[PDB]
Design a protein around this ligand. Structure first.
Ligand code: NA
Ligand code: NA
Ligand code: NA
Ligand code: NA
Ligand code: NA
Ligand code: NA
Ligand code: NA
Ligand code: NA
Ligand code: NA
Lengths: 125, 125, 125
């Protein structure tokens, strides 16, 4: 029943340094068009981006494919449900891959301390 | 089937600072009566509290309840079995919630370094 | 169904300090023959060893640390498949224990930042 498992850890100060070197580049690689617009106006953009990077990198690793099946970051996004829990929403080729794998349930968890954000994703049939 | 997933990370030095500001308040909030009695005489109270917080916060996220404070920290506790695996024991509304969700198994794992403790919890039917 | 869950976090500088004190001792203890051969010529050997330690401690916790004696980190070999995905290959008593437990699938995920490596392992029937 478990189709894949993924984890990530992000050092928030490293993302801050990346933004200072190359501006919006990291945000546009990692965020969807929708999420990019929220980062542009967020009050804690570095922490927002660090936590999203953690979730989306964990989700990409959970899907677990090489370049042949690229779950590009620009075809899925994270949102919070009514309880504040992170949830994944997929479209385009990202959603097509989930259908091909027979993904029936996705589990997402995220935590952050001052200096690090960590996330785990499990996809299941 | 996986019913929920939760993870947490705790910066031990942040817990140390919390204790310096407000004494036993954090311990009284996170620990059950039984766990409080061990903390009172523990040789590493800060680390004991940091690791229990990580496990119990991970566990609350795995239950992922919309019941306002449905998995209250004062209604469950952690112990180790003969294999060294951390285990959850629930009473009151916490146990009622577990029964309503149909929880048949609870998997808990915990790790700590000098500066951080982390934990992941999966509940399953 | 899930047979076990384990997580670990490794402070890389702690591994680096161990190596400065006792050289190859740690690597020779925890790594399998295959992993030892990579450690000897790796361009980032300390980071290699720290990440392997994270997987081996996570996998040990998943199987159950106090189960038996004669289990050892060098029997939890990690390798990369043709996609670069980390995978477990078991030898000796670890392989026997897996067969006794009815392990049908093993899921491994690993992530590293500059100061920490973390891993989670799930074994399943
Ligand atoms: Na921190
Ligand atoms: Na306190
Ligand atoms: Na204890
Ligand atoms: Na115990
Ligand atoms: Na348990
Ligand atoms: Na700390
Ligand atoms: Na540490
Ligand atoms: Na050594
Ligand atoms: Na780091």
């Amino acid at each position: 029943a478990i189709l894949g498992l993924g984890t990530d850890i992000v050092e928030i100060a490293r993302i801050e340094a990346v933004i200072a070197r190359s501006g919006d580049r990291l945000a546009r690689r990692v965020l969807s068009d929708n999420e990019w617009a929220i980062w542009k106006t967020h009050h804690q953009p570095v922490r927002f981006l660090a936590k999203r990077f953690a979730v989306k990198e964990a989700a990409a690793k959970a899907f677990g494919t090489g370049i042949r099946n690229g779950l590009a970051f620009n075809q899925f996004e994270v949102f919070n449900d009514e309880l504040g829990k992170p949830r994944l929403r997929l479209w385009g080729e990202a959603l097509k891959l989930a259908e091909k794998l027979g993904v029936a349930n996705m589990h997402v968890t995220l935590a952050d301390e001052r200096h690090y954000a960590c996330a785990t994703v499990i996809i299941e049939s």
